[PDB]
Design a protein around this ligand. Structure first.
Ligand SMILES: N#C[C@@H](O[C@@H]1O[C@H](CO)[C@@H](O)[C@H](O)[C@H]1O)c1ccc(O)cc1
Ligand SMILES: N#C[C@@H](O[C@@H]1O[C@H](CO)[C@@H](O)[C@H](O)[C@H]1O)c1ccc(O)cc1
Lengths: 490, 492
């Protein structure tokens, strides 16, 4: 729907700006139990609770990228992508998740080959160390990130990072410790829609014996400690002048529902519980004041030493942006009691504004509404409030619904103009944000490939590249990929 | 000393013709005749009489400025200065000796305020009447602790009746009512730090009665004040309001400026405006306390019933703002190492006179706490304008206290040449013009303290008047340079 002069041009951005595509291990790799790979929390969840996956599927094969990585690289190369962000499977590297469990040589070999091939083709690898795939051995031993000691998971995650640094550090110049920590903690232990599927008694999830008001925070605390530790290790023994490390946050833009100053306050609390939760700790060493005043004793305290390691523990930050919501105020009162950790923001997140209209056009699936302006707001907040650090939009895209009840014909799947329009608009927003002073340095189209979508299973295709699972996971560029190719190679 | 240049000095024609300039006072501070003509004992009579040690110079206001007997001269000074209005308060115990209906109305009390009001009006001076200015009848204090009334009922009904008496006897003449004045200072100082009557505070704290709870009582009192206000305004709107009459309340407020550039201090600043101004402003504006306060004080801050929120929301036609100075708000993180002691600590922010550069926010005006920072007044007005509906505003108090102690007496000559005060007054008046140009709905300015009088725990160690009171003589009044300039300004 954009005019020719509105369609982003590569020369709109600096020569050193980077464009790429991204993926996550469990979503695309497959070979879930091959070549020594250990079982992950997701293998476990999908295998034991198909009823918790919309289409009862699993990612035993995913996009088969473990075996087809060479093709994934060819595709990235043909599109002229400057970089590729992928994650490393913790259990594929450490089957038992620990040092004593030993390192899986085949796991190391796979990522080593992928990294070299990428670099061989002039593509920069942005390596995400962890993308929700916790080794089931750690889950069973101490609950994974639910580790009440704030020690075991931290040490185990740190060793995992070490193994990644030791084996790929000479080639990798860009590391991301965690990806979407907020969604991980909230969905895995709040609503329990993600593995292992825990939530408060009374709530509907596989294991309603957790605490949706506490476990998400415990896990979040351990993630931050893990991040801080991994970064301290990186800086002390692996960082080089031109290498960088950080983490990527999942974030929905927030806009005051109404004009009342109350909604502005609600909006502020929403940015805090969504973005600040993990951003403020790495920026200043502690959680947002709002969260501490609201979650109170349910939000763990950091030791002074931990605050120090946390503050400034990054050289760049990733932002995973898809949509935004209107934040509507909720007063503290005897009539309201938070149920989910996310309810601690005392604000309902609305899709429709007070005028009954969606914040932005629906992109197809249950939650993505196109609102590029939210990305700008986000970038302006990063610029003006959090020190304008180097930013990478590590994820941005939409999911095309493709269900058994309503299959998406391959032809229609390839003509993803809605996705194309969406991507172009957000890329344009970056150009605008850059001129406004934003220190954004890159954009990664989310999902190089159509793959497993967690609890949504295979009901959505997020790739810019189509994967025909019925035919040996053959990949085909969608219109979006073709435009990105043109854009990059112009 | 560094005063405004001729072109900078405010002129009356800078403001609309309907803008109002006046002076203010409070009953216990100037009246005197503490036990004359049937007047009942107040919490302050009690406090000063029983705890002289809690008053800096050990004085009391048994006489004050002897305004009960000299009100005529007070009105003369107001007239001579060409003031448009006069804000004074009514002594609850002087009107209702027992503080209750069954206790009866004191004829002499009624007569006094009636004569004062009539003399003001026959002189073309508009009376802005403050129903309550901290002087709670001791009978109510002994009966149920006054505003500490744990049932949130008795004090509400007694205040409401008091208000009724005032509306009944002076409503025909008074067109501007203020239910309360400085509720924040009253609750915080009377039950937080305990420097105000009755002098209560948490055990371990230094006050006459360290058996209270500095983290709860100030809130209880504040809650009762808000309910009292809501009930009185409801009574007023229903039976006494006329198209040309207005009612509201005045808040004591210090401007807040972020200590540093960190966003944390901006948050601290916001929390500080909330606990100082929002505490009582938000309830009358939207019907409930600031979110920050509810999130921080939690259960120590009472909840309003739905019917109460309804009565509170919009319970005013105008608001008074008592502004003197400002502070830099410095963030304090929530942590196990920090526990609030005073209700005001709930804002999680230190209030600093000096900024990161070690310099005061503004020039010191003399007493222990006033620093000249009129820009703070502008900030405050912009907040009322942009955040709270831009309601009609009256700077119901503004001035400084000239120190005058036994050890360091202030010679009458020096007391009369109050150029520090004059400069301060002129600058704030100028700030109002600037604020008006920025769209502020401010409609008046009241120089705080028509007269030198009793200054609560500071006793007579400070002269806040624009008019000097020679207590050695028979409280004879003499216009200070500030008063003389106001006269010139008003009558130009
Ligand atoms: N995960 C998550 C949330 O983030 C995005 O969810 C997409 C859905 O599969 C995923 O493809 C993308 O990589 C994630 O960044 C999320 C938000 C809302 C709902 O309903 C589910 C997940
Ligand atoms: N804040 C404060 C003080 O309460 C204002 O004080 C004025 C001085 O006369 C009074 O006229 C006005 O009504 C009040 O709003 C204060 C007094 C003493 C000390 O030690 C601290 C603060």
């Amino acid at each position: 729907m954009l005019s020719p002069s509105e369609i982003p041009q590569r020369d709109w951005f600096p020569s050193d700006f980077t464009f790429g595509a991204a993926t996550s291990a469990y979503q695309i790799e497959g070979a879930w139990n091959e070549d020594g790979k250990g079982e992950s929390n997701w293998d476990h969840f999908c295998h034991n609770h198909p009823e918790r996956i919309l289409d009862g599927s699993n990612s035993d094969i995913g996009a088969n990228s473990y075996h087809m990585y060479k093709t994934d690289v060819r595709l990235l190369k043909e599109m002229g992508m400057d970089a590729y962000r992928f994650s490393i499977s913790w259990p594929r590297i450490l089957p038992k998740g620990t040092k004593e469990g030993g390192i899986n040589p085949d796991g190391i070999k796979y990522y080593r080959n992928l990294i070299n091939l990428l670099l061989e083709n002039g593509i920069e690898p942005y390596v995400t160390i962890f993308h929700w795939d916790v080794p089931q051995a750690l889950e069973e031993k101490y609950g994974g990130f639910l580790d009440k000691s704030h020690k075991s998971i931290v040490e185990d995650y740190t060793y995992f990072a070490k193994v990644c640094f030791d084996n790929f550090g000479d080639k990798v110049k860009n590391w991301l410790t965690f990806n979407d920590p907020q969604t991980f903690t909230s969905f895995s232990y709040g609503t329990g829609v993600f593995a292992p599927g825990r939530c408060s008694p009374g709530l509907d999830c596989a294991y309603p014996t957790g605490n949706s008001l506490v476990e998400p925070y415990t896990a979040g605390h351990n993630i931050l400690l893990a991040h801080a530790e991994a970064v301290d290790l990186y800086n002390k023994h692996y960082k080089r002048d031109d290498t960088r490390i950080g983490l990527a946050f999942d974030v929905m833009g927030r806009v005051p529902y109404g004009t009342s100053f109350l909604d502005k306050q609600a909006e502020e609390r929403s940015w805090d519980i969504n973005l600040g939760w993990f951003l403020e700790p790495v920026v200043r060493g502690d959680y947002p004041f709002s969260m501490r005043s609201l979650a109170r004793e349910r939000l763990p305290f950091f030791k002074d030493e931990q605050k120090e390691k946390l503050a400034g523990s990054y050289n760049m930050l990733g932002l995973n942006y898809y949509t935004s919501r209107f934040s509507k105020n909720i007063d503290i009162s005897p009539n309201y009691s938070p149920v989910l950790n996310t309810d601690d923001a005392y604000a309902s997140q609305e899709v429709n504004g007070p005028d009954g209209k969606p914040i932005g056009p629906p992109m197809g699936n249950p939650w993505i509404y196109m609102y590029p302006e939210g990305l700008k707001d986000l970038l302006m907040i990063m610029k003006n409030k959090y020190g304008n650090p180097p930013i990478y939009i590590t994820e941005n895209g939409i999911g095309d619904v493709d269900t058994k009840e309503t299959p998406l014909p391959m032809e229609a799947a390839l003509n993803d103009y809605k996705r194309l329009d969406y991507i172009q608009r957000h890329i344009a927003t970056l150009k605008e944000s850059i001129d406004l002073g934003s220190n954004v340095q890159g954009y990664f189209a989310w999902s190089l490939l159509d793959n497993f979508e967690w609890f949504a299973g295979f009901t959505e295709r997020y790739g810019i590249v189509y994967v025909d699972r019925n035919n040996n996971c053959t990949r085909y560029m969608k219109e979006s990929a073709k435009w990105l190719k043109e854009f990059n190679t112009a």
